[PDB]
Design a protein around this ligand. Sequence first.
Ligand SMILES: [Zn+2]
Ligand SMILES: [Zn+2]
Lengths: 672, 672
Amino acid sequence: MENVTVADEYLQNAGKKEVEYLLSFEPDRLLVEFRAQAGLDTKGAKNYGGWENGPDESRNPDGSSKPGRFTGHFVGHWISAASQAQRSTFATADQKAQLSANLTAVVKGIREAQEAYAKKDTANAGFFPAFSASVVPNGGGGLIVPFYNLHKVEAGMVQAYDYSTDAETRETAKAAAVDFAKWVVNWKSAHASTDMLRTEYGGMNDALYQVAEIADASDKQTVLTAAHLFDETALFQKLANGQDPLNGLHANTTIPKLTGAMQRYVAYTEDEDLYNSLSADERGKLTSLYLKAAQNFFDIVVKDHTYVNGGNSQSEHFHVAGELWKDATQNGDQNGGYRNFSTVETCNEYNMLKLARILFQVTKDSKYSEYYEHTFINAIVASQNPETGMTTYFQPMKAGYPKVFGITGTDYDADWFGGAIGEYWCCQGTGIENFAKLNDSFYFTDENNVYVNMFWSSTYTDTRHNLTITQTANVPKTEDVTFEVSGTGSANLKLRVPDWAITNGVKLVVDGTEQALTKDENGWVTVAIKDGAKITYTLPAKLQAIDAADNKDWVAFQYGPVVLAGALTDTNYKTNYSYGGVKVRVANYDSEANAKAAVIPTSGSVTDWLKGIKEDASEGSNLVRTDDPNTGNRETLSFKFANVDGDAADLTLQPYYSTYKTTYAIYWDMAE
Amino acid sequence: MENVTVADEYLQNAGKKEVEYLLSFEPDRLLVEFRAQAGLDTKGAKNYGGWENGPDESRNPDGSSKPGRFTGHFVGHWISAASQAQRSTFATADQKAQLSANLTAVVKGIREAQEAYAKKDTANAGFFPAFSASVVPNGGGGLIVPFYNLHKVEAGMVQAYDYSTDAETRETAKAAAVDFAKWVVNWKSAHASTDMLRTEYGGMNDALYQVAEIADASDKQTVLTAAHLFDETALFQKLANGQDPLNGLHANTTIPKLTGAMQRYVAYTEDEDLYNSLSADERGKLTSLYLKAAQNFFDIVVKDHTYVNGGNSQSEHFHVAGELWKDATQNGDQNGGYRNFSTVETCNEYNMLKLARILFQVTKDSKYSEYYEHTFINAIVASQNPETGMTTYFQPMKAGYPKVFGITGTDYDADWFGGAIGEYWCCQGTGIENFAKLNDSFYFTDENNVYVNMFWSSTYTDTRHNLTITQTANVPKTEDVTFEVSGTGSANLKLRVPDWAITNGVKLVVDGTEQALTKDENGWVTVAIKDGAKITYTLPAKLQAIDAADNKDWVAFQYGPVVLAGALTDTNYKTNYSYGGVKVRVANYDSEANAKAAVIPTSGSVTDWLKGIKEDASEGSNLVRTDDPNTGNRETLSFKFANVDGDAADLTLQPYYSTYKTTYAIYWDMAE
Ligand SMILES: [Zn+2]
Ligand SMILES: [Zn+2]
């Protein structure tokens, strides 16, 4: 197998915690609501509760009856994450065997429930019985976003087909997935005049195109039909025209529709039979509608809707182009609900990363890699508590809030959470995938080329080209990246010249000779590689200030690919949150912390003070690097301000991604 | 502390004898050679002699100069066994305190000698001075197998660290062990071109990996370097590839090497820092080379090189696959040397049990537990004289020999052995450990599970799950095994359905209700337990004939897990042996006795007569159980042949393990 064993200690920890969390779920509990709805033996089990509550107070840990719930959505993500983990390299052999056993139990359990349900309600044969079919597609009786929830199960099944080491389990997942697609078409046929897209359906089009990719030849058209039902072509047409229609749209709702557009492109273009199936017009639309919508959506989001950490949205929605500071600061700091703190739902970056990834695969444009790296570090790796492994919902952008993480709802992390019932936010479900597949986008490989998407210490056993590539990277703690190659084959390594590097300082040495940084048409430097190749790639980290389009005086600092955060005040994870939405924990504001985020130039204006920040972070800069490059790991990166008045002078700045024990400032308030 | 108290009277006797033996050794006499070599005061002491003689005629009780010897090997075993005993439950509180004091004296004494030696020969600092460093590694001046001898001391130091109740002792042992490991590296650095693996080195890799496990972080890599130098990867590679290269290999030399391969596996997989230290290639080879070599070695030894009692080897060697009858019978019955009687060295089964144990711990496969039970009974328990507590070297498989045991070489058993000077064979060293750690493999515990490895009357205080488990077992004298559970926690009990039970008769009753014999993927039946649980497991014993692959007419009989032996003639322990190898006592043939082991069917052919053997040993069988199930202990099991001519008609068959006063037949010669 191709594999990427990850050497980085921080990432190894992050991935290990996820494997441990994943192992803590009991199949019988994950399976309860499917079995109940299918009229099968629940074996006395409770569901995991929270978003995975069902209608029934007996099966719900919290004893609640018909609560607002999203039944099946986290089980789906668990199938995805368990599939990913028992094929990645974070889990030991023993962990993988147990995780793969539990995956198998769940995949077969759902299939068994699907088959029993098909007998009980033949009209809806193929439905995944996570909840009542009667409430499709707008929800009912407390069940929210039915197709969103089902989407996770369908996508999960595809991951199980792709990655289960057990052949039976793969074939069962495929059958389950194809039969669900068939249900979608049947259902729609019997509800011809019902609209399916009004209510959030997640990436259902994406998932069904994936099923079409794995389906037997004779099923492909049926599944493509199901998939195309979930293409929101009105939205795509607007995006493909270069319009920005995002103001007021639910952000995480929208983003996966464009990944689905991209999956339609890939499904048809990778299989001549499917491509030949289309009208020459629809063949054209793959590019003019579907790919263009995704390209434009991505560009519009990054330019006009993205915060310094790669993330987007506030109160779960896109707002006016360019109005980032307003959304993050003019919406209140009261306890509870969704307010200033509700910036940058984390699911959104899972989905943005998948969109960048598939756009990279199709186009090879380096800008998607630049984004991927940035958002991976600054939103995804940043989402996780390194001690508990749990992950964030929102990522507050205004200074003075703590990071708030979910809880397990299992016996995992009992030392932290006791016997608390889990909540299972959407964001925890995309969360478990983030860490199960943490190493899935280090490299991309086609016929001749190995693209280095990110700079991390790892070993890639490139089975396509018969090469082992070992990268040593610690950017931006130290500046030199090395690659050593062994094997029998040959390839071109492709390197990005990061925009976060000091361009003049960038140096490429290949087998002891310097090489020019000549970019291909997609932005990549090419290095021929074979057994014995040795590369030193020097990437001096640039320190930069980054403001908001709508406020020059709201400023974050980034060193290399790492956004910095100031540690403001202590926080207590037991009490530092309230609730909003459906059982979503939200950060409590620390006004005393916020005030410390005043940056007040001693001498000169704000403008002058910003000009005095040196790219090299050296003495004389108004923000100086204080850590010793040759002592401590990457997380010991440290900066301090200079020529500032107030508490700011005393603050240390450190990586945002590793900041969790304290309230923090990522954006600072420049004070003239 | 977890503990297992053994109620079985035979095993209680066996363990108590060992404790008594261990206590008869004086630390000053164990330390003599280490002190002498280090230039320390020997206090006028003589060493114990035999294999524990040194070069010097004045310290050897026998007055020999530079005899064939193995100085340190038995001291090391004694350190192991004293450590095991003073942490087991066979010894009284007084016996534990005394033995612990004596362990302390010996560990500090060796550490003292190690530190003194390091000043006198700074090149070889860390060497354990059992003998001259200059004869490392091939031996010289009468000192044989240097690294094998030092292996025992190293492994000893680990046991002391594991089990000593004195913290100074634990720390002294760890220091000694780690410094020995550093010495291995230094010595090899200074003798880079010397091959270290050609002469038997015992399980040096195993012990050094164990030392890597207990070592301070900053020392682990140095110790792992030492351990891996004793990894005989050429042998492992052949076994991993599924070849049988065993013919002509010394068996006890070979077996512990594979235990070492497993220790490599465990050392790295249980410590994330060590695991993460490995290249991706070597991470894979943990499974593809080391685990697999061990797995295949086990399978090949058991299928093609093992006698009916679980044991292997003739003349200390493996021979041709399947030629067990030939090795055991076509090599002479003359007195002295190593001939037919030299089958089944006893060390070998100590080592096989340890390999099986660690394979079980990693894989949980029930076949390792099946083998463990079989060989623990039929080769290990069978190796001891229940009156003297002394143990066997060889175990003759050809009929007509007596069991020959060692002597104490101490004041222990002086009524039997007088003032005779000890021999301290290998098999006596493993033997003292066998009986010291006699309760160490009744159960295996992991997070949710308690595996019943063997069926013995005991009480297990399971401190991991807060349960006390009282097992009552007498198999195969009576068929019912009962478990009673008390406490406050919960676990799953895991039970084997033994292949030696009559399948159809196996019955499981849990808290009054029969439960099915559903096996997990590893072969185990699962029983939820907690306070007040009561289990009756009915295991009706199967009687069976077991031949040799190379001779259908060379046949042994087994009832449940107990191999039977016929009592043939009286034997006199004072005169019934000669010598072979280095001071090894070997059994003298009784040709009369052998002739009684002729089995001639009255009516029918051999084939017919073997078919007439009933699984239940009932009337009508050609071999019938004659003892009353409800009268006597397990050792009163008795059987007689039916429908046979000659003296065989008159013989009684009883358990092999408790046969010691007579010559015996285990394999019978079927005659048409
Ligand atoms: Zn979310
Ligand atoms: Zn031996």
